[PDB]
Amino acid sequence: QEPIDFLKKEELKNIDLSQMSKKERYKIWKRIPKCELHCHLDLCFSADFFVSCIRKYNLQPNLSDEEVLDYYLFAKGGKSLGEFVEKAIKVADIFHDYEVIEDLAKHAVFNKYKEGVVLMEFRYSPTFVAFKYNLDIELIHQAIVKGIKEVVELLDHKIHVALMCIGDTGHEAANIKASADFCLKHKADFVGFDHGGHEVDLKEYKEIFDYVRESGVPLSVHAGEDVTLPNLNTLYSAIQVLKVERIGHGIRVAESQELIDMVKEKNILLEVCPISNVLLKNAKSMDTHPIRQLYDAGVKVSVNSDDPGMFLTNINDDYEELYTHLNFTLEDFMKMNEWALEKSFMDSNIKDKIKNLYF
């Protein structure tokens, strides 16, 4: 046996969530064999870990542990994606050296393991991690790969982890072209390529994304997250120009039957991040989160945590919210995780083993 007794498809009918306190429900969420496709490793940490970093480097001697969390993080949410991006820039204060980066990676993987994630695609932005202390992206990558390797080996590969590379917009020393070149340079370690930060229309980078994609690195980019944008151009470009296989967030797809039909026809999966959307005001409330409409419309959607460090949440919190506010069932969760497995960029030999073990 292992610590978590993962739920099997045959067992789901016997579980009566309606009986259960929140504590008891969380024991069930943990036992869902989760496949998570959208989590930013560089903003994936616990409160305790983050504060430990701030103390280690004596960055906030005049602030308390809780004042540190308020000053740096986004647990209470904010007005917009724009505000989130600015706050995340502050968090880079912790990217002091390669030891802390390795440790962040190790703890990020271990906590996902503890939470009952069996398949984990982590993504990170080399340029985002590098800018604050002018670090070497080669050594950042080395540290992250080492940290992940050491934990998955300790865990006897009971969690499978793959990495994606993010070229992003909205911090100093951001560079999409350089991020693409870096991704391809480290194609052996990266299973996919992303764009995050400010939501921009990525049509203007068509050439860079074509090159990455045609090199055999599939694309999943952030699009259809930011409700403040005056149209859905970013989604049309992601789908029609970038030819992405998945979309980060993509919740604004719900606002257009054309896009709904398009994503369905192209077998594109939307990597939905419920709590993120509510905290950034890209959904009015969890009660009105577009995932329900999208799921009912037949669109492939999966559940994701986005930035556990920024929101001081974990993946089981997103499951809790979907159950409580939108009446998602265990059967729904199982189906979505199997879609995530199918659409994962991980090696098919690995995915086949995970499918046979849990699904």
Ligand X SMILES: Nc1ncnc2c1ncn2[C@@H]1O[C@H](CO)[C@@H](O)[C@H]1O
CB of 250 to ligand X, least distance (A): 11
CB of 42 to ligand X, least distance (A): 5
Contacts of 323 (CB under 8 A, 6+ apart): 17, 25, 329
Q: Counting contacts by CB under 6 A, is residue 40 touching ligand X?
A: yes
Residues 125-154 that bind ligand X (CB under 6 A): 125, 128
Judged by CB under 6 A, the stretch of 11-19, 81-89, 236-244, 286-294 that binds ligand X is 81-89
Min separation Cβ 158 and ligand X, Å: 26
Query: Considering beta carbons, is residue 7 or 242 the nearer one to Zn ion?
Result: 242
> What is the smallest separation between the CB atom of 312 and Zn ion, expressed in angstroms?
16
Residue 164 touches which of ligand X, Zn ion, none (Cβ within 5-8 Å per kind) = none
Instruction: Report if residue 318 touches ligand X, rule: CB under 6 A.
Output: no
Tokens, residue 353:
């083993």
- Tokens 């690995």, residue located: 350
Hey, how many other C-beta atoms are within 10 angstroms of the C-beta on 298? 10
Residue 99 CB contacts under 8 Å (≥ 6 apart), including other chains: 143
Q: Does residue 42 interact with ligand X by CB under 6 A?
A: yes
Q: What is the C-alpha to C-alpha distance for residues 148 and 303, in angstroms, rounded to an integer?
A: 22
Beta bridge partners of 220: 246
Cβ-count burial of 95 within 10 angstroms (0-12 exposed, 13-18 middle, 19+ buried)? buried
The listed partner (Zn ion, ligand X, none) that binds 309, CB under 5 to 8 Å by sort, is none
Instruction: Describe the strand order of the beta sheet including 34-40 as a list of residue ranges.
Output: 34-40, 117-124, 160-169, 190-197
For the segment 188-207, give every residue that binds ligand X (CB under 6 A): 196-197
- Return the number of the residue (74 or 98) whose C-beta is nearest Zn ion: 74
- Rounded CA-CA distance 344/157 in Å is 17
Q: Is 261 annotated as a binding residue?
A: no
Contacts with ligand X by CB under 6 A lie at: 40, 42-43, 81, 85, 88, 124-125, 128, 166, 168, 171, 196-197, 222, 225, 276, 306-307
Q: Which residues does the annotation place in the binding site?
A: 38, 40-42, 168, 197, 222, 225, 249, 306
